[PDB]
From a paper:
We also determined the crystal structure of the catalytic region of lpWalK at 3.2 Å resolution in the absence of ATP/ADP. The CA domains reach out, causing the ATP-binding pocket to be positioned further away from the phosphorylat­able histidine His391 in the DHp domain; we therefore defined this structure as representing the open state of WalK. The structures of both CA domains are similar to that of its close homologue S. mutans VicK. It is also similar to that of B. subtilis WalK. The major differences were the positional shifts, by up to 4.6 Å, of the loops and α3. Indeed, a global alignment of lpWalK with the open chain of smVicK indicated an ∼4° rotation of the CA domain relative to the DHp. A dramatic rotation (∼46.1°) of the lpWalK CA domain was observed when it was aligned with T. maritima HK853 in the open state. The DHp domain is sandwiched between two CA domains. In the open WalK structure the DHp is completely symmetric, with two straight α1 helices, whereas in the closed WalK state it is asymmetric, as characterized by helical bending in one α1 but not the other. We observed that two straight α1 helices of the DHp domain from the open lpWalK were randomly bent by 16.7–26.8° during 50 ns of simulation, indicating that the bending is an intrinsic property of the α1 helices.
A typical TCS is composed of a sensor histidine kinase (SK) and a cognate response regulator (RR), which are encoded by genes that are often clustered in the genome. Modulated by stimulating signals, an SK first performs an autokinase activity and phosphorylates a conserved histidine in its DHp domain. Here, we sought to determine the crystal structures of a WalK homologue, lpWalK from Lactobacillus plantarum, which shares 60% sequence identity in the DHp and CA domains to our previous solved smVicK structure, in different conformations in the presence of ATP analogues or ADP. The catalytic region of lpWalK contains one DHp domain (amino acids 370–450) and one CA domain (amino acids 450–624).
Author numbering:
A (entry chain B): 386 to 479, 483 to 561, 572 to 610
B (entry chain A): 386 to 479, 483 to 561, 573 to 610
Amino acid sequence: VSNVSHELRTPLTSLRSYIEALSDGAWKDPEVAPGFLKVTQEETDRMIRMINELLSLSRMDSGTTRVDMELVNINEMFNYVLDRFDMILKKDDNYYTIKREFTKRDLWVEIDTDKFTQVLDNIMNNAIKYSPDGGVVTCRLLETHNQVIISISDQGLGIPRADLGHVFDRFFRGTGLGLAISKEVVQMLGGRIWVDSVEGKGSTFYISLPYE
Amino acid sequence: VSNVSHELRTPLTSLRSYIEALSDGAWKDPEVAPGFLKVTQEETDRMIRMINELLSLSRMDSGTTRVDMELVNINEMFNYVLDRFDMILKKDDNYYTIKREFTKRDLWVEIDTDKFTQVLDNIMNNAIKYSPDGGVVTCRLLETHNQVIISISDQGLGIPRADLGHVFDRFFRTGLGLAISKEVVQMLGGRIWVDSVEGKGSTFYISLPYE
């Protein structure tokens, strides 16, 4: 599409600029060279991600993806993920807190650990990105009906109620595929994923899993 | 589809390696840094081209590509392209010759100068790259029947007659230049094809409506 290849074109040409800058001499100058190099690094990793997600949406949707399913404890799992995010957030130069509300009963669900961790990641990420003033990101885990409900909420920028359903279609606004990922994955893990937001009260992404 | 994302994945991870190398300190060292940067440069430009080709087949497949058609002199045109290639080959640190045989009647055809230039380029490229022992790349331009015939030949590695037809199918060995040229020429209302004998050589033909 004019869309995808151009959305790949952008960081490429970006990279081209920084690289050109170094090549023409910037590499010799210590005031800019590490910095420019860092930008190049980031752009590259970004593109590898975009590529990989593109690929997973090629193999998952079209649709031959071996999904490694284990009976995992989501209490621990969610705590691991949130730990990693707390670690990235505490070494920042800006500012974010993680408000955990996990039920006191240990829950076990049939999920792919790696693919679900990539889910939780993508959603936490998109949350922090739609929360410009910072503050608290709220993460809940509790059961109902034999749904295990994970919910992740930000009190940042709202989300248009006119477009609330299409957040899960490909590239709806660090890559812009994380939602497509999580939706597809969760759907495959046999759960349901959706969003509820009031502009600009805040945003909340829901995940539901078959409990037993 | 996994193919495309793998052919994009490779130079990316390449880039990652070189970039990482520099970032960890290589930039401070003058013996490797210009060189590593040259690699990064090349890989990046490469990826941009691959993107563009992908995109041109995205607009061509869906036929959403306005092809800017002019009545051009292919004699001069081919001479321009071959001039550029002669400059590229003469400013090299390695070996290649351009054998021009252009008919002495000036021919004019309805073509998109730029897209046909990318054709001639892609094919000349496939010639120079597929000529491991080096030597001469042969470029002919002559009319027949009201065909304008361009032919470009290399005396390098042959091309298997068992798979000789699929050189123009998507991603047969950036790796899309052939798909480009084929599609473009078809769109310019001409015909494109290949004839090769391993390992005598390879020869790409282009035919255009002459009048």
